[PDB]
Amino acid sequence: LLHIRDVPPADQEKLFIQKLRQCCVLFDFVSDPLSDLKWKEVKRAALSEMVEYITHNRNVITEPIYPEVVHMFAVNMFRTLPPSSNEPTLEAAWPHLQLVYEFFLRFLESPDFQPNIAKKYIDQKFVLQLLELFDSEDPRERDFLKTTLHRIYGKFLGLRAYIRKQINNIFYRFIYETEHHNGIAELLEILGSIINGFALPLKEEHKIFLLKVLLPLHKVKSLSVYHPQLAYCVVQFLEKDSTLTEPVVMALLKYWPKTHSPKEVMFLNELEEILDVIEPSEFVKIMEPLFRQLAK
Amino acid sequence: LLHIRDVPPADQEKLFIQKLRQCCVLFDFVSDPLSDLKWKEVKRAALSEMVEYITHNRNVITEPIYPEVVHMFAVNMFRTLPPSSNEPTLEAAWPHLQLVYEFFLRFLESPDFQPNIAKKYIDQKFVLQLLELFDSEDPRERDFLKTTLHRIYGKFLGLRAYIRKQINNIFYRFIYETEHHNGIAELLEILGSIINGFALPLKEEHKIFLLKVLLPLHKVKSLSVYHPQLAYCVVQFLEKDSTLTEPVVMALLKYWPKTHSPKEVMFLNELEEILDVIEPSEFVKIMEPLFRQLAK
Amino acid sequence: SPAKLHSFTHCGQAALTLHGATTTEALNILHSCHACRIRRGLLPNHIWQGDITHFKYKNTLYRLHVWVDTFSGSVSATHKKRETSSEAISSLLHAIAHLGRPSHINTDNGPAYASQEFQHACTSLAIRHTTHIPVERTNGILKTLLYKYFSDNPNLPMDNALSVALWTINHLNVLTHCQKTRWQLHHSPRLPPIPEEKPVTTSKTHWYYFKIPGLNSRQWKGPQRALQEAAGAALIPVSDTAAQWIPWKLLKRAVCPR
Amino acid sequence: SPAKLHSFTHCGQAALTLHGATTTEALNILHSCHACRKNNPQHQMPRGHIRRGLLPNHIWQGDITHFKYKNTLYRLHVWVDTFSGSVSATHKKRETSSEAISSLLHAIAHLGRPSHINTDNGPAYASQEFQHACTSLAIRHTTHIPYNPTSSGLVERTNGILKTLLYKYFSDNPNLPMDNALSVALWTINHLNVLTHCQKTRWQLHHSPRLPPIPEEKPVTTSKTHWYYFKIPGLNSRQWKGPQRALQEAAGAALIPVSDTAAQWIPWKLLKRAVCPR
Amino acid sequence: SPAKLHSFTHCGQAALTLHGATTTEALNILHSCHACRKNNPQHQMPRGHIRRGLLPNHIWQGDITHFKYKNTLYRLHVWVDTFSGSVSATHKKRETSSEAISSLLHAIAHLGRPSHINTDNGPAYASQEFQHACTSLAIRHTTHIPYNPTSSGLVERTNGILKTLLYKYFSDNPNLPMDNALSVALWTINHLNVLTHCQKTRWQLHHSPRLPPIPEEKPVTTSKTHWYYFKIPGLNSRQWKGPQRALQEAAGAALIPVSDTAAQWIPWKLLKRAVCPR
Amino acid sequence: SPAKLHSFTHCGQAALTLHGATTTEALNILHSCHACRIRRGLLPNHIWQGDITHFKYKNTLYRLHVWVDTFSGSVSATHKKRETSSEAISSLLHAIAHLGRPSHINTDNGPAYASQEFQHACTSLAIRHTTHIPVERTNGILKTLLYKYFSDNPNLPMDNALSVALWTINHLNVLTHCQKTRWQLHHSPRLPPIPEEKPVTTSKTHWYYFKIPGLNSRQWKGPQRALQEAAGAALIPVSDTAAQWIPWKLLKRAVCPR
DNA sequence: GAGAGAAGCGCCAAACACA
DNA sequence: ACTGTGTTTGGCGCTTCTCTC
DNA sequence: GAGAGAAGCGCCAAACACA
DNA sequence: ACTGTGTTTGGCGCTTCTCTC
Ligand SMILES: CN(C)C(=O)CCc1cnc2c(c1)c(N)c(C(=O)NCc1ccc(F)cc1F)c(=O)n2O
Ligand SMILES: CN(C)C(=O)CCc1cnc2c(c1)c(N)c(C(=O)NCc1ccc(F)cc1F)c(=O)n2O
Ligand SMILES: [Mg+2]
Ligand SMILES: [Mg+2]
Ligand SMILES: [Mg+2]
Ligand SMILES: [Zn+2]
Ligand SMILES: [Zn+2]
Ligand SMILES: [Zn+2]
Ligand SMILES: [Zn+2]
């Protein structure tokens, strides 16, 4: 076709839309290692010029672009997950995937982005389909997904309580129904980022969220792979309010495994940080039960 | 009294008027060498602070000052001339005279001077009484008088033809009626300054002025004391128009003294400059009579 | 080229894959070389581990002071010829310069780390210090990489070898779990906090009056928005078709036109 | 005549105007006088700026400075990134190509591998050993105009900054070891001090996400050349020389034939505009 | 704590602010640090200006410069009037008090008798013979701060101007005699060249009517003194010294005790403000 | 003091009267000293007269080249030890530097003033030159003043004596006819021409933004009218009670407020 | 009760030195 | 290709706050 | 005929060097 | 009392003028 930068601005938006649409065609690397080589090369090139162009001009993004880009992302990303296979394998379509993630990230944080236009082109269905994608096995996939979900949650206002309820639901499903998940650490990072910005006083919904899904997450046999991040999140609650720490320590002590295991040290480590914050405010109410449980 | 610079500006003008008025009192040095020593000293001082103050502040001179200063100058200068006595003697009142001349000169050329205010406070009588004062014998007196009359003629517009007629009258009186005068050189300088600014074509009045009073001025027995300046004035006419030089050379040749005298070289000198300008424009109409007169 | 890169650094095949090499020829080069054929900290610069190790040579010994981050695995190593509290202080300061200030420090008992000098040095930086009696794996990677480098060329001054080994470990090799290098994991900025009941607005950058370099102009033409800001220059669109990096001396602060 | 008067006295513009001449003729007479242009040190040409990288680890500047401490002359090898401003510095006992290579390797370990490095024409930088080392890691090394330190200005500035902190560190405690002082100063410069204009830290710029790619550049230059009076950078001269005509003009400098044999690269700040002889 | 962090690292304002401190506390910490003020060459104080006459022949400035011509080192004695800018210059073979007296007499003949003359502390100006000559004609002679040529700046500038014309006069004809060149240059400077800002000639200012008298002056000075870090003008120092307290402050300089025995006059441009110890 | 002034310069009593001395004590000092008891040009620098004179000494001779203006009597004298066209050129250039460029020059025939060197020098300056065969009085005044100076002190280098004599003749002695010195008569500006049918308006000077010296200010406070303009400074009223000479670097050109 | 001094804080051109 | 730059510092305009008629 | 290029002219900040 | 200054130079805003549709 024709490069977007070498056209008069009068019809430049139309060429941008056309170049958006020409990348909507799919290309399957998993089907066969060699298929449509020049088509794939021109798609990669076009993605490169698009990501270059979007981040060097202002007042380029207007209303007839917002839904089409969302459609492009949905066509390129939202799909059936690869079959579960339990170093992790790498997705063979990584070039196009990485380039389109770069483009989407640069598009979401442009200064010309308007929050009054995406409320009708991005809805709960899109964010649910995005959150479903965290179960991928490629770590880079999960990294880009985390840094995209952070911006999505930060930018929008009417999609905060919905996402909190959905994350509670997915935590319930992971801890009770389905035991197959690998995006837990990135989700814990998102939770830590969200909870670092709470205000006082804490509403009872956050107390329920603590008392229901976060402490019992310690019971997972695969705790170690996401051990540090989890602890971080806990540390970010008892700092906001030192009064509400009694249920946390009570749950940690009562549900502490009475049997010897190499992972017990994990808990000990966490306890240390808790102790490092619990000494002030005269917190000796549960000191004796804590010592009694630690003695065994 | 009180210094003018150490008072609020609200009543500063009144103090300026009072200090103007307190110097109106006369002091005669010729009457006796010692009389009113401290009065003379305070008058000299006050003149000094007045000339200092007038040239360092703006918007200080307004309407109630213009006629009073003219009155002060008239009281301090306009008087009966000292008796004629034919190195020249020096006026014994030179301190006050010089200081008041300095003050008047600085006042006449202040940027705040307005030509629409002195047309009703200075009239022909003042300028006639000033021109009558050129007959003084102190050369410094005549120098200040010349540099004052130049500014007076330059500033005012309705007093130009009147002064030209008066200078013609005084030239007639000096050349025919009265033979006692000593301010001729300064007057010739004033005439040269005035005639350097003529425009074309020259009006017939200037031709009459040339043909009546300027050439016959060569007949004065006291020509030498003002010989150079006179020549200068002549040079400034024949430059404006080379056609009107025939009457000048005719008068110079016909009225050339046929008898030998040491002052004849004077004329020769003048002739040289005339020749130095008369060679172009094919001026050979009177070359033969000029050579015939020069041969004798 | 990948062959020269591996011949000089001897990094893993997954390191070569990040360069122009593809997985198959990466494995080919990996097996074509004769010489080659839990986290306790919660955030980077939270808990460090400090060891002193003996590097053996044919006719000499070296003492490597090594500091390893418990979260990213980033390594700071310094070689000396003795062992004292002063050199422990120097190594800690060097590691702080390379990595940053740690909040908590952990090491073993010994002649160093226990004298009043090290304690005072820790208190000057306000670093909490805990010592215990029994990582040792990164030490092994460092040893084997140094040994490969010296086997390739016996004429090395032991400082270039250490620098190249540190570069290979921190910037070239990639972690298996997350497919990242140690440098990226250590220095990746964290996600900003998200305030509740308050939208996170996008930061608005500044406006500049600019002059085009190499023209000797004296009139600031137009206030423009800055795209990117760096040390020594800022990115300004000189026209609607291209952008240029204008130095700070040719930029003047402006106000929004409103 | 104004022309002969100026040829005799070399008076200024207003002197020629008062003797009768228009402003244009007097100004042309002034501009056409070789004597009045070879002897006036004043001149008016644009300023030059060092080349800057478009992303971290693109272009680096390196230099060697001296430091006096406890009767010891330490040599500080300093490398600075032209994009982020990040600084790496190592102290040694002397200066040598091998020590320059070691400092480069330490800087690469501390910051990363650069694409290009530009340094002055120091004895240890034009050596064959340094070129071989740079080619080994595929690093393009260029050199500045000789005897023109301003072309390395950024790194020179950094040198001063570094030394200043060291002096402070030695004012409080003269018994502080050199390595400790250098490490603390590097930590302060790269992590604690905030850059004046971008209001950020050098480390933050160095490791900020590389999401903005490189804008494309254009090697298009002006196709016209001019005449110039010149001064040789190596030796200071009281009066200008020439004028000659530039073989080719670059951004910030020009190629000028000093002699009939070979030419030389002259920065804009030692050049003066000349009127065309024809 | 910001205080201990700055005492250890001597970091800047923003570093202390990001670790928790108000702008006021951080700025006070910066201003109270002796190390950060003895080692920073930057400072901020008002500029000084030479004393100027109130009318022609009131204050003169004189200096001696060198000129190389045909393997001969001529000494140019230059006097300049601080009101009109008029210049008198004489060429001699060496420098001596007697030749300074002769040049002064020639300048007096050319321009007139001045009231005061101020020159640097040259060997031929502090001599007893020159003082006797100045007292003979009742001329008050003062001297500048030693090793501070800027205090004679005007005459220094004139020197350069003069020399420039000479070079032009020797560019056209290298066989022109020195006396001819000097006379022509003096004629051009004083009669032909027009001053840049007042748009007049030096000769016109010198002989313009003295009708404006002298405005009265006030010797009133500030009665308060401050503390200052200082640098000795004679020898350049990398770091400031002190701080000490000024015995008395003048316009453009201050009296500072360098040692416990005697004080010294220091210009404003080698001083730095200091915080009061109490 | 008048006594010291006459003892050093030996000028006339009318010269002392311009100083603090009054006529009676001026005459007293004049008669208390043992050693003391037509114009052809039309304007200054119009016609000059050039002479070469032999100054006699006990064991040497000097040759004084003297140029005298025929209108003011101003004298420029230069002493040499030989007589040639080159020294005539040098003396003429020195006189031009001291007095100004003459339009017409007059002198006697001799080895100098007649060679092609002097003619070419005159044509370079565009000076019309006329030579004739027969002022000599000013030469006599110069001789007698030099003789008095040497009689007062025999240890003089003949340059200081000439400089002091020139100063006394040009700046100290006053002419009898007009009570002026030669310097004032020579350098008195002439009256400007007076155009006809056009008023001579007073020239309006400029307005300046100013900063007070010695304050390190950075804001130009108020535009004011300049009283007097000189080299290096201008007179500005800082307040309504005093005025100050502000240097040019602290002045900025303004526009009338209207 | 309320407008006038006082404290706080971000910004800027001129100096400065890097052999 | 070739090319000067980054930090320090008092003085101000600005905003917000406290003690007094 | 008429508004668009061209010539004319006064002004200014940054460079410069005075051992 | 003690203290930096004056000239040169291309680039512009300004005003006035000449050749072309
Ligand atoms: C060419 N040949 C054969 C050689 O031997 C080259 C020797 C060599 C190598 N490096 C050098 C220098 C000399 C050098 N004189 C300076 C230097 O003057 N700095 C002061 C400085 C002044 C002005 C400025 F604007 C900035 C400044 F930094 C310098 O900085 N560096 O790096
Ligand atoms: C005190 N003792 C014992 C002595 O021997 C004193 C010897 C002595 C006498 N006169 C001198 C000098 C030295 C001198 N170094 C200069 C001089 O550096 N000029 C260059 C200059 C630089 C900067 C500036 F801003 C302006 C300038 F002009 C100078 O101009 N003059 O007159
Ligand atoms: Mg350098
Ligand atoms: Mg000197
Ligand atoms: Mg000097
Ligand atoms: Zn290998
Ligand atoms: Zn010239
Ligand atoms: Zn400090
Ligand atoms: Zn006598």
Identify the three-state secondary structure at position F111.
coil
CA distance A23 to A45: 10
Neighbours of A140 (CB within 10 A): 17
Q: Which two tokens stand for residue B173?
A: 């009186």
Identify the three-state secondary structure at position C253.
strand
* Separation in Å, CA A150 to CA A197, A240, B64: 13, 21, 84
CATH fold of B4-80+91-225:
Leucine-rich Repeat Variant (1.25.10)
- Residue F250 alpha carbon to ligand 2 centre in Å: 25
Q: Which two tokens stand for residue B113?
A: 């001077």
Beta strands at D116-119 and D59-69: parallel, antiparallel or unpaired:
parallel
What is the dihedral angle through the alpha carbons of E127, E128, E130, E135, rounded to the nearest 10 degrees?
150
* Cβ–Cβ under 8 Å, residues F252 and E105: no
SS3 content of chain C, % helix, strand, coil (to 5): 35, 20, 45
CA distance D241 to F137: 54
Where residue A14 falls (left for φ over 0; alpha for ψ -120 to 50; beta otherwise) is alpha
CA distance F102 to F98: 11
Buried b (16+ CB within 10 A) or exposed e, E177-187: ebbbbbbbbbb
Which residues, in sequence order, are CB contacts of C152 under 8 Å at separation 6+?
C7, C10, C35
E strand map for chain F: 47-56, 61-69, 75-80, 104-108, 128-132, 207-210, 223-225, 229-230, 233-236, 244-247, 251-253
What is the dihedral angle through the alpha carbons of C28, C31, C35, C37, rounded to the nearest 10 degrees?
170
DSSP string, C12-77: -HHHHHTTT--HHHHHHHHHT-TTT-----SSTTSEEEEEEEEEE-SS-EEEEEEEEETTT--EEE
Cβ(D48) – ligand 1 distance below 6 Å: no
Which residues, in sequence order, are CB contacts of D207 under 8 Å at separation 6+?
C187, C188, C189, D56
Give the CA F213 to C1' H20 distance in Å. 38
Neighbours of E266 (CB within 10 A): 22
Cβ(E147) – ligand 2 distance below 6 Å: yes
* Cβ–Cβ under 8 Å, residues B153 and B187: no
CA–CA–CA angle B227, B232, B235 (5° rounding): 130
Residue type for position E265: W
Identify the three-state secondary structure at position A144.
helix
CA distance D56 to D83: 6
Instruction: Name residue C246's beta-bridge partners.
Output: C234
CA distance E90 to E191: 17
Cβ(D153) – ligand 1 distance below 6 Å: yes
Most distant CA pair in chain D, distance: 76
- Of the residues D119, D120, D235, D236, which should be mutated to test ligand 1's pocket, given the most ligand atoms within 8 Å of the CB? D120
Identify the three-state secondary structure at position B226.
helix
Q: Which nucleotide is nearest to E41 (CA to C1')?
A: G16
CA–CA–CA angle B98, B103, B109 (5° rounding): 125
Q: How far is CA D1 from the centre of its chain?
A: 47
Cβ-nearest to A105 among D211, D213, D215: D211
For residue B189, which residues of chain F lie inside 8 Å, CB to CB? 191
Residue in the structure block whose two tokens are 């008195």: F188
For residue A8, which residues of chain C lie inside 8 Å, CB to CB? none
Q: Which two tokens stand for residue E278?
A: 């109490």
CA distance F66 to F49: 8
Buried b (16+ CB within 10 A) or exposed e, D84-99: bbbbbbbbbeeebbeb
Which residues, in sequence order, are CB contacts of C129 under 8 Å at separation 6+?
C105, C106, C107, C113, C118, C119, C122
- Under DSSP, the state recorded for B6 is G
Judge: E213–B105 Cβ closer than 8 Å, yes or no.
Answer: no
Buried b (16+ CB within 10 A) or exposed e, F35-59: eeeebbbbebbbbbbbbbbebeeee
Q: Which CATH architecture has domain E59-207?
A: 2-Layer Sandwich (3.30)
Residue of B5, B49, B56, B57 to mutate, testing the E interface (most E Cβ within 10 Å of its Cβ) = B56
* Separation in Å, CA E93 to CA A56, C118, E153: 70, 72, 24
CA distance B50 to B62: 15
Which F-chain residues 69-108 have CB contacts (< 8 A) with chain B? 71
- From which experimental method does this structure derive? cryo-EM
Burial of F156 (0-12, 13-18, 19+ CB in 10 A): middle
* Cβ–Cβ under 8 Å, residues C90 and D179: yes
CATH 3.30.420.10 fits C47-187, yes or no: yes
Instruction: Judge whether residue C231 contacts strand H, using its CB and a 7 Å cut-off.
Output: yes
Closest CA to E160 of E268, E67, E273: E67
CATH fold of A4-82+89-217:
Leucine-rich Repeat Variant (1.25.10)
Examine chains F and E and say if they touch (3+ CB pairs below 8 A). yes
φ/ψ of F15, rounded to 5, equals -70, -40
Residue in the structure block whose two tokens are 């610069």: C45
Q: Which two tokens stand for residue A18?
A: 């056309």
CA distance F1 to F7: 10
Residue D136 forms contact with F (CB below 8 Å): no
* Cβ–Cβ under 8 Å, residues A273 and A231: yes
CA distance D184 to D171: 15
Residue of D5, D167, D173 to mutate, testing the E interface (most E Cβ within 10 Å of its Cβ) = D167
CA distance C104 to C94: 16
* Cβ–Cβ under 8 Å, residues E186 and E202: no
Closest CA to C51 of C144, C113, C120, C116: C113
CA distance C82 to C61: 10
DSSP string, F23-46: HHHHHHHHHT-TTT-----SSTTS
How many H-runs (helices) and E-runs (strands) does chain B carry? 13, 0
Residue B166 forms contact with F (CB below 8 Å): no
Burial of A216 (0-12, 13-18, 19+ CB in 10 A): middle
Q: Which residue of C has its CA nearest to A157?
A: C199
CA distance C168 to C145: 9
What is the dihedral sign for C-alpha A285, A288, A293, A294? positive
Question: A66-76 and A94-108 helices cross at what angle (nearest 10)?
Answer: 150
Residue in the structure block whose two tokens are 């917190």: A283
What are the boundaries of each domain within chain B? 4-80+91-225
The stretches of A55-91 forming alpha helices (DSSP H) are 66-76
Neighbours of C71 (CB within 10 A): 19
Cβ(D150) – ligand 1 distance below 6 Å: yes
Instruction: Name residue D253's beta-bridge partners.
Output: D267
Element (H, E) at E202: helix E202-206
Q: Which two tokens stand for residue D206?
A: 């160095």
Neighbours of C170 (CB within 10 A): 25
**Atom number in ligand 1 closest to CA D159:** 28
